[PDB]
PDB file of C-alpha atoms in Angstrom:
ATOM      1  CA  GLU C   5     -37.496 -35.931   9.339  1.00 35.70           C
ATOM      2  CA  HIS C   6     -38.474 -32.684   7.608  1.00 33.93           C
ATOM      3  CA  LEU C   7     -41.148 -34.841   5.997  1.00 35.61           C
ATOM      4  CA  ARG C   8     -42.434 -36.475   9.188  1.00 35.59           C
ATOM      5  CA  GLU C   9     -42.827 -33.189  11.075  1.00 37.02           C
ATOM      6  CA  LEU C  10     -45.549 -32.124   8.640  1.00 36.60           C
ATOM      7  CA  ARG C  11     -47.451 -35.363   9.208  1.00 37.08           C
ATOM      8  CA  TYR C  12     -47.245 -34.687  12.946  1.00 35.09           C
ATOM      9  CA  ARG C  13     -48.268 -31.033  12.719  1.00 33.83           C
ATOM     10  CA  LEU C  14     -51.066 -31.489  10.198  1.00 34.35           C
ATOM     11  CA  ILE C  15     -52.809 -34.047  12.405  1.00 35.54           C
ATOM     12  CA  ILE C  16     -52.512 -31.605  15.307  1.00 38.16           C
ATOM     13  CA  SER C  17     -54.295 -28.990  13.203  1.00 37.78           C
ATOM     14  CA  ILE C  18     -57.095 -31.206  11.885  1.00 37.16           C
ATOM     15  CA  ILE C  19     -57.707 -32.788  15.285  1.00 37.78           C
ATOM     16  CA  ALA C  20     -58.004 -29.311  16.809  1.00 36.93           C
ATOM     17  CA  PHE C  21     -60.142 -28.466  13.783  1.00 38.01           C
ATOM     18  CA  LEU C  22     -62.694 -31.133  14.697  1.00 40.03           C
ATOM     19  CA  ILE C  23     -62.776 -29.725  18.230  1.00 39.35           C
ATOM     20  CA  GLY C  24     -63.674 -26.251  17.019  1.00 39.08           C
ATOM     21  CA  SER C  25     -66.305 -27.809  14.770  1.00 39.29           C
ATOM     22  CA  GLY C  26     -68.000 -29.839  17.481  1.00 36.29           C
ATOM     23  CA  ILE C  27     -68.231 -26.795  19.734  1.00 34.23           C
ATOM     24  CA  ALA C  28     -69.434 -24.551  16.908  1.00 34.21           C
ATOM     25  CA  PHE C  29     -72.136 -27.076  16.000  1.00 34.03           C
ATOM     26  CA  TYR C  30     -74.066 -25.940  19.074  1.00 31.10           C
ATOM     27  CA  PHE C  31     -73.547 -22.254  18.280  1.00 31.47           C
ATOM     28  CA  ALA C  32     -74.641 -22.855  14.693  1.00 31.70           C
ATOM     29  CA  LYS C  33     -78.232 -21.668  15.099  1.00 26.78           C
ATOM     30  CA  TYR C  34     -76.769 -18.617  16.826  1.00 29.14           C
ATOM     31  CA  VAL C  35     -74.022 -17.820  14.322  1.00 28.77           C
ATOM     32  CA  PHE C  36     -76.679 -18.330  11.656  1.00 30.21           C
ATOM     33  CA  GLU C  37     -78.828 -15.452  12.930  1.00 30.93           C
ATOM     34  CA  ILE C  38     -75.808 -13.161  12.713  1.00 28.79           C
ATOM     35  CA  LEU C  39     -75.366 -13.941   9.014  1.00 28.49           C
ATOM     36  CA  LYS C  40     -79.008 -12.975   8.408  1.00 26.72           C
ATOM     37  CA  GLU C  41     -79.218  -9.588  10.138  1.00 28.88           C
ATOM     38  CA  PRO C  42     -77.471  -7.745   7.257  1.00 29.71           C
ATOM     39  CA  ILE C  43     -80.377  -8.743   5.000  1.00 30.94           C
ATOM     40  CA  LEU C  44     -83.203  -9.080   7.532  1.00 28.78           C
ATOM     41  CA  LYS C  45     -82.876  -5.422   8.521  1.00 28.78           C
ATOM     42  CA  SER C  46     -81.611  -3.739   5.350  1.00 28.55           C
ATOM     43  CA  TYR C  47     -84.248  -5.212   3.029  1.00 28.51           C
ATOM     44  CA  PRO C  48     -87.136  -6.824   4.987  1.00 30.47           C
ATOM     45  CA  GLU C  49     -89.095  -7.216   1.746  1.00 28.28           C
ATOM     46  CA  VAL C  50     -86.372  -9.520   0.437  1.00 27.93           C
ATOM     47  CA  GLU C  51     -87.384 -13.085   1.251  1.00 29.44           C
ATOM     48  CA  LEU C  52     -84.829 -15.793   2.010  1.00 31.09           C
ATOM     49  CA  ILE C  53     -86.245 -19.298   1.591  1.00 30.03           C
ATOM     50  CA  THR C  54     -84.657 -22.749   1.513  1.00 34.05           C
ATOM     51  CA  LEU C  55     -85.335 -23.588  -2.133  1.00 30.56           C
ATOM     52  CA  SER C  56     -84.054 -27.016  -1.094  1.00 27.80           C
ATOM     53  CA  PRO C  57     -86.560 -29.794  -0.268  1.00 27.57           C
ATOM     54  CA  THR C  58     -85.507 -29.697   3.391  1.00 27.56           C
ATOM     55  CA  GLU C  59     -81.812 -28.854   3.671  1.00 26.50           C
ATOM     56  CA  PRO C  60     -81.569 -26.388   6.584  1.00 25.69           C
ATOM     57  CA  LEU C  61     -78.731 -28.499   7.973  1.00 27.01           C
ATOM     58  CA  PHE C  62     -76.522 -28.238   4.880  1.00 27.54           C
ATOM     59  CA  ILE C  63     -76.389 -24.543   5.750  1.00 31.15           C
ATOM     60  CA  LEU C  64     -75.977 -25.113   9.485  1.00 27.76           C
ATOM     61  CA  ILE C  65     -73.065 -27.465   8.790  1.00 28.34           C
ATOM     62  CA  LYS C  66     -71.269 -25.399   6.145  1.00 31.29           C
ATOM     63  CA  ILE C  67     -71.317 -22.590   8.712  1.00 30.42           C
ATOM     64  CA  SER C  68     -70.302 -24.737  11.685  1.00 31.59           C
ATOM     65  CA  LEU C  69     -67.168 -25.473   9.650  1.00 34.48           C
ATOM     66  CA  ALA C  70     -65.908 -22.178   8.224  1.00 32.85           C
ATOM     67  CA  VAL C  71     -66.569 -20.257  11.436  1.00 35.35           C
ATOM     68  CA  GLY C  72     -65.095 -23.268  13.204  1.00 36.09           C
ATOM     69  CA  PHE C  73     -61.863 -22.479  11.378  1.00 35.97           C
ATOM     70  CA  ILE C  74     -62.109 -19.022  12.936  1.00 34.93           C
ATOM     71  CA  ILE C  75     -62.189 -20.175  16.556  1.00 36.93           C
ATOM     72  CA  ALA C  76     -59.610 -22.860  15.773  1.00 39.06           C
ATOM     73  CA  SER C  77     -57.252 -20.505  13.936  1.00 40.47           C
ATOM     74  CA  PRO C  78     -55.414 -19.800  17.225  1.00 42.94           C
ATOM     75  CA  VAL C  79     -54.081 -23.368  17.149  1.00 39.38           C
ATOM     76  CA  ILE C  80     -53.712 -23.609  13.372  1.00 38.86           C
ATOM     77  CA  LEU C  81     -51.519 -20.507  13.166  1.00 38.95           C
ATOM     78  CA  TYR C  82     -49.531 -21.854  16.102  1.00 38.97           C
ATOM     79  CA  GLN C  83     -48.783 -25.191  14.437  1.00 37.79           C
ATOM     80  CA  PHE C  84     -48.026 -23.420  11.159  1.00 33.93           C
ATOM     81  CA  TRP C  85     -45.463 -21.040  12.656  1.00 35.81           C
ATOM     82  CA  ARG C  86     -43.835 -23.700  14.828  1.00 32.60           C
ATOM     83  CA  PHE C  87     -43.285 -25.605  11.575  1.00 30.28           C
ATOM     84  CA  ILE C  88     -41.275 -22.926   9.768  1.00 27.78           C
ATOM     85  CA  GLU C  89     -39.522 -20.670  12.292  1.00 27.38           C
ATOM     86  CA  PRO C  90     -37.166 -20.959  13.985  1.00 27.96           C
ATOM     87  CA  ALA C  91     -37.699 -24.436  12.504  1.00 32.42           C
ATOM     88  CA  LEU C  92     -36.226 -23.487   9.117  1.00 31.75           C
ATOM     89  CA  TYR C  93     -36.101 -19.701   8.710  1.00 33.35           C
ATOM     90  CA  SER C  94     -35.972 -17.412  11.750  1.00 32.26           C
ATOM     91  CA  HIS C  95     -34.092 -18.311  14.927  1.00 31.73           C
ATOM     92  CA  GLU C  96     -34.846 -16.126  17.948  1.00 27.99           C
ATOM     93  CA  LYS C  97     -37.922 -17.258  19.871  1.00 27.78           C
ATOM     94  CA  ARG C  98     -38.891 -13.929  21.440  1.00 26.06           C
ATOM     95  CA  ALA C  99     -40.067 -12.931  17.970  1.00 27.79           C
ATOM     96  CA  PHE C 100     -42.147 -16.107  17.809  1.00 28.89           C
ATOM     97  CA  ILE C 101     -44.763 -15.241  20.433  1.00 30.15           C
ATOM     98  CA  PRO C 102     -45.423 -11.775  18.956  1.00 26.66           C
ATOM     99  CA  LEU C 103     -45.889 -13.601  15.657  1.00 26.80           C
ATOM    100  CA  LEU C 104     -48.627 -15.785  17.140  1.00 26.91           C
ATOM    101  CA  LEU C 105     -50.489 -12.966  18.896  1.00 26.98           C
ATOM    102  CA  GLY C 106     -50.263 -10.666  15.894  1.00 29.15           C
ATOM    103  CA  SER C 107     -51.302 -13.361  13.432  1.00 28.49           C
ATOM    104  CA  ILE C 108     -54.082 -14.282  15.865  1.00 28.13           C
ATOM    105  CA  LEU C 109     -55.596 -10.799  16.117  1.00 28.86           C
ATOM    106  CA  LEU C 110     -54.932 -10.300  12.409  1.00 28.03           C
ATOM    107  CA  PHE C 111     -57.242 -13.251  11.822  1.00 29.85           C
ATOM    108  CA  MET C 112     -60.068 -11.764  13.871  1.00 28.89           C
ATOM    109  CA  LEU C 113     -59.389  -8.501  12.054  1.00 28.67           C
ATOM    110  CA  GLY C 114     -59.292 -10.250   8.699  1.00 29.73           C
ATOM    111  CA  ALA C 115     -62.539 -11.950   9.679  1.00 32.57           C
ATOM    112  CA  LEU C 116     -64.229  -8.818  11.024  1.00 34.42           C
ATOM    113  CA  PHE C 117     -63.235  -6.733   7.999  1.00 32.66           C
ATOM    114  CA  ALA C 118     -65.141  -8.850   5.481  1.00 33.22           C
ATOM    115  CA  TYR C 119     -68.259  -9.449   7.571  1.00 33.04           C
ATOM    116  CA  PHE C 120     -68.511  -5.769   8.534  1.00 31.64           C
ATOM    117  CA  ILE C 121     -67.089  -4.046   5.446  1.00 28.79           C
ATOM    118  CA  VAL C 122     -66.899  -6.296   2.380  1.00 30.85           C
ATOM    119  CA  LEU C 123     -70.140  -8.282   2.663  1.00 27.75           C
ATOM    120  CA  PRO C 124     -72.318  -5.236   3.455  1.00 30.19           C
ATOM    121  CA  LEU C 125     -70.810  -3.182   0.629  1.00 33.61           C
ATOM    122  CA  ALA C 126     -71.238  -6.228  -1.609  1.00 30.45           C
ATOM    123  CA  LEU C 127     -75.008  -6.551  -1.226  1.00 31.22           C
ATOM    124  CA  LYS C 128     -75.315  -2.822  -1.901  1.00 31.51           C
ATOM    125  CA  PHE C 129     -73.864  -3.470  -5.361  1.00 35.27           C
ATOM    126  CA  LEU C 130     -75.843  -6.692  -5.750  1.00 37.58           C
ATOM    127  CA  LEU C 131     -79.402  -5.470  -5.146  1.00 40.00           C
ATOM    128  CA  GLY C 132     -78.874  -2.010  -3.685  1.00 38.42           C
ATOM    129  CA  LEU C 133     -78.210  -0.494  -7.106  1.00 41.67           C
ATOM    130  CA  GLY C 134     -81.111   1.798  -7.906  1.00 38.52           C
ATOM    131  CA  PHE C 135     -84.838   1.147  -7.727  1.00 41.35           C
ATOM    132  CA  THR C 136     -84.279  -2.366  -9.052  1.00 41.24           C
ATOM    133  CA  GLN C 137     -86.516  -3.613  -6.244  1.00 40.09           C
ATOM    134  CA  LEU C 138     -89.176  -4.864  -8.659  1.00 40.27           C
ATOM    135  CA  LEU C 139     -86.896  -7.636  -9.928  1.00 41.26           C
ATOM    136  CA  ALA C 140     -86.140  -8.900  -6.425  1.00 36.99           C
ATOM    137  CA  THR C 141     -88.525  -9.737  -3.580  1.00 36.79           C
ATOM    138  CA  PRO C 142     -89.588 -13.348  -3.181  1.00 39.80           C
ATOM    139  CA  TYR C 143     -86.610 -14.034  -5.462  1.00 39.37           C
ATOM    140  CA  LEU C 144     -83.708 -14.246  -2.996  1.00 38.71           C
ATOM    141  CA  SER C 145     -82.169 -17.696  -2.522  1.00 38.82           C
ATOM    142  CA  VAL C 146     -80.681 -18.460   0.901  1.00 40.17           C
ATOM    143  CA  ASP C 147     -78.029 -20.750  -0.595  1.00 40.70           C
ATOM    144  CA  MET C 148     -76.559 -18.333  -3.143  1.00 41.28           C
ATOM    145  CA  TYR C 149     -76.453 -15.679  -0.423  1.00 40.60           C
ATOM    146  CA  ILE C 150     -75.400 -17.717   2.619  1.00 36.50           C
ATOM    147  CA  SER C 151     -72.899 -19.721   0.569  1.00 36.94           C
ATOM    148  CA  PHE C 152     -71.521 -16.397  -0.656  1.00 34.73           C
ATOM    149  CA  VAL C 153     -71.311 -14.787   2.789  1.00 35.37           C
ATOM    150  CA  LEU C 154     -69.285 -17.601   4.366  1.00 33.85           C
ATOM    151  CA  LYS C 155     -66.943 -18.273   1.444  1.00 30.62           C
ATOM    152  CA  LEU C 156     -66.419 -14.509   1.273  1.00 30.53           C
ATOM    153  CA  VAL C 157     -65.873 -14.105   5.020  1.00 30.87           C
ATOM    154  CA  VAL C 158     -63.326 -16.937   5.099  1.00 29.26           C
ATOM    155  CA  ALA C 159     -61.291 -16.166   1.977  1.00 29.48           C
ATOM    156  CA  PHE C 160     -60.729 -12.698   3.435  1.00 34.64           C
ATOM    157  CA  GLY C 161     -59.946 -13.986   6.909  1.00 37.22           C
ATOM    158  CA  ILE C 162     -57.149 -16.090   5.442  1.00 39.81           C
ATOM    159  CA  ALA C 163     -56.080 -13.688   2.688  1.00 39.81           C
ATOM    160  CA  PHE C 164     -55.160 -11.188   5.412  1.00 41.70           C
ATOM    161  CA  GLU C 165     -52.428 -13.637   6.425  1.00 40.28           C
ATOM    162  CA  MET C 166     -50.293 -13.292   3.294  1.00 35.71           C
ATOM    163  CA  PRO C 167     -48.833 -10.076   4.777  1.00 37.41           C
ATOM    164  CA  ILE C 168     -47.346 -11.464   8.000  1.00 39.93           C
ATOM    165  CA  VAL C 169     -46.629 -14.794   6.309  1.00 38.40           C
ATOM    166  CA  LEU C 170     -44.823 -12.899   3.547  1.00 38.48           C
ATOM    167  CA  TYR C 171     -43.288 -10.322   5.888  1.00 33.08           C
ATOM    168  CA  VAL C 172     -41.301 -13.026   7.663  1.00 32.30           C
ATOM    169  CA  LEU C 173     -40.397 -14.443   4.249  1.00 34.92           C
ATOM    170  CA  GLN C 174     -38.657 -11.172   3.404  1.00 33.83           C
ATOM    171  CA  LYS C 175     -36.941 -10.557   6.740  1.00 35.98           C
ATOM    172  CA  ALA C 176     -35.453 -14.038   6.383  1.00 35.31           C
ATOM    173  CA  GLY C 177     -34.215 -13.074   2.933  1.00 34.53           C
ATOM    174  CA  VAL C 178     -36.253 -15.604   0.965  1.00 36.05           C
ATOM    175  CA  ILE C 179     -38.067 -12.887  -0.985  1.00 35.18           C
ATOM    176  CA  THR C 180     -36.890  -9.311  -1.554  1.00 35.29           C
ATOM    177  CA  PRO C 181     -39.230  -6.275  -1.650  1.00 34.09           C
ATOM    178  CA  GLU C 182     -38.301  -5.755  -5.307  1.00 35.19           C
ATOM    179  CA  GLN C 183     -39.128  -9.333  -6.319  1.00 34.13           C
ATOM    180  CA  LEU C 184     -42.673  -8.435  -5.285  1.00 36.11           C
ATOM    181  CA  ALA C 185     -42.786  -5.083  -7.078  1.00 35.32           C
ATOM    182  CA  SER C 186     -42.164  -7.151 -10.206  1.00 35.53           C
ATOM    183  CA  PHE C 187     -44.900  -9.612  -9.246  1.00 37.72           C
ATOM    184  CA  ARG C 188     -47.414  -6.779  -8.842  1.00 37.64           C
ATOM    185  CA  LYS C 189     -48.946  -7.272 -12.289  1.00 33.88           C
ATOM    186  CA  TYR C 190     -49.092 -11.052 -11.882  1.00 35.91           C
ATOM    187  CA  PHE C 191     -50.710 -10.867  -8.444  1.00 33.15           C
ATOM    188  CA  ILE C 192     -53.407  -8.595  -9.866  1.00 32.33           C
ATOM    189  CA  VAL C 193     -54.862 -11.653 -11.590  1.00 28.48           C
ATOM    190  CA  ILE C 194     -54.524 -13.636  -8.358  1.00 29.72           C
ATOM    191  CA  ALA C 195     -56.794 -11.155  -6.591  1.00 25.99           C
ATOM    192  CA  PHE C 196     -59.050 -11.174  -9.652  1.00 23.76           C
ATOM    193  CA  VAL C 197     -59.064 -14.977  -9.777  1.00 24.70           C
ATOM    194  CA  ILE C 198     -60.020 -15.500  -6.139  1.00 27.74           C
ATOM    195  CA  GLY C 199     -62.364 -12.546  -6.499  1.00 24.34           C
ATOM    196  CA  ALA C 200     -64.162 -14.366  -9.303  1.00 23.16           C
ATOM    197  CA  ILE C 201     -64.263 -17.710  -7.497  1.00 22.67           C
ATOM    198  CA  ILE C 202     -66.507 -16.325  -4.751  1.00 23.55           C
ATOM    199  CA  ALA C 203     -68.125 -13.196  -6.203  1.00 22.94           C
ATOM    200  CA  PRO C 204     -71.041 -13.470  -8.684  1.00 24.33           C
ATOM    201  CA  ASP C 205     -70.664 -10.367 -10.863  1.00 22.44           C
ATOM    202  CA  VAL C 206     -67.796  -8.013 -11.749  1.00 22.82           C
ATOM    203  CA  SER C 207     -68.855  -5.215  -9.383  1.00 21.51           C
ATOM    204  CA  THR C 208     -68.349  -7.585  -6.446  1.00 19.55           C
ATOM    205  CA  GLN C 209     -65.349  -9.493  -7.811  1.00 20.30           C
ATOM    206  CA  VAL C 210     -63.476  -6.223  -8.299  1.00 20.28           C
ATOM    207  CA  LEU C 211     -64.695  -4.743  -5.015  1.00 22.81           C
ATOM    208  CA  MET C 212     -63.358  -7.257  -2.492  1.00 21.20           C
ATOM    209  CA  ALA C 213     -60.211  -7.847  -4.564  1.00 21.48           C
ATOM    210  CA  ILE C 214     -58.805  -4.310  -4.341  1.00 21.78           C
ATOM    211  CA  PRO C 215     -58.632  -4.566  -0.511  1.00 23.80           C
ATOM    212  CA  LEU C 216     -56.382  -7.644  -0.651  1.00 24.11           C
ATOM    213  CA  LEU C 217     -54.097  -6.079  -3.253  1.00 26.23           C
ATOM    214  CA  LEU C 218     -53.928  -2.881  -1.207  1.00 23.09           C
ATOM    215  CA  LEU C 219     -52.938  -4.763   1.952  1.00 22.80           C
ATOM    216  CA  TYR C 220     -50.333  -6.615  -0.102  1.00 22.62           C
ATOM    217  CA  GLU C 221     -48.895  -3.179  -0.872  1.00 23.92           C
ATOM    218  CA  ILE C 222     -48.564  -2.542   2.857  1.00 22.94           C
ATOM    219  CA  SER C 223     -46.415  -5.661   3.148  1.00 23.51           C
ATOM    220  CA  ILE C 224     -43.915  -4.443   0.554  1.00 23.48           C
ATOM    221  CA  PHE C 225     -44.082  -0.996   2.157  1.00 25.57           C
ATOM    222  CA  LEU C 226     -42.974  -2.603   5.422  1.00 28.05           C
ATOM    223  CA  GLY C 227     -39.927  -3.637   3.423  1.00 29.80           C
ATOM    224  CA  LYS C 228     -37.716  -1.383   5.528  1.00 28.44           C
ATOM    225  CA  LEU C 229     -34.228  -2.889   5.641  1.00 27.27           C
TER     226      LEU C 229
END
């Protein structure tokens, strides 16, 4: 039965996923403007053009999905939690609700952080480094950028979860604070691996990474038993 529950909770997450995608589809052209402002106001000379033959949808869809995972996270986190505790780890259920709410706001926070802190600071190191304006004007490619923004905004939105998800793991006794202090070095690559999978150059890869690592240090810090 431990095996069937997953097949009955996963479908509840994907089905809700398609609901947040259908709704977002309409707010795609809107959410799309948002993702442009950072560049349309900071560097108006920079020109973003669809190098593609006529693929403005590919961008509208990719967005309508990721962001769709943002508005649907409230259900996703719910199904997730209700599949592990009290299910298999915790027990009390008064600690369940606060888990949902917290994890919920932590998602919006994890989502806001990147879009308002990471992404902006990223571009600054991408083309905002010195008077290197001559090598970049009708050069900007919407894809590279847009694709970057989203992937970056999501990875961070989720990454933020590790804490709470790991916090509960420790309180239950599955993982001790020390076991992590010994995984510090190994995790460093993790943050540098994910940081390389979405960031173009070192400056960016390193940038975003640090924040995750740092937050991961908060988790262990919370290790107050």
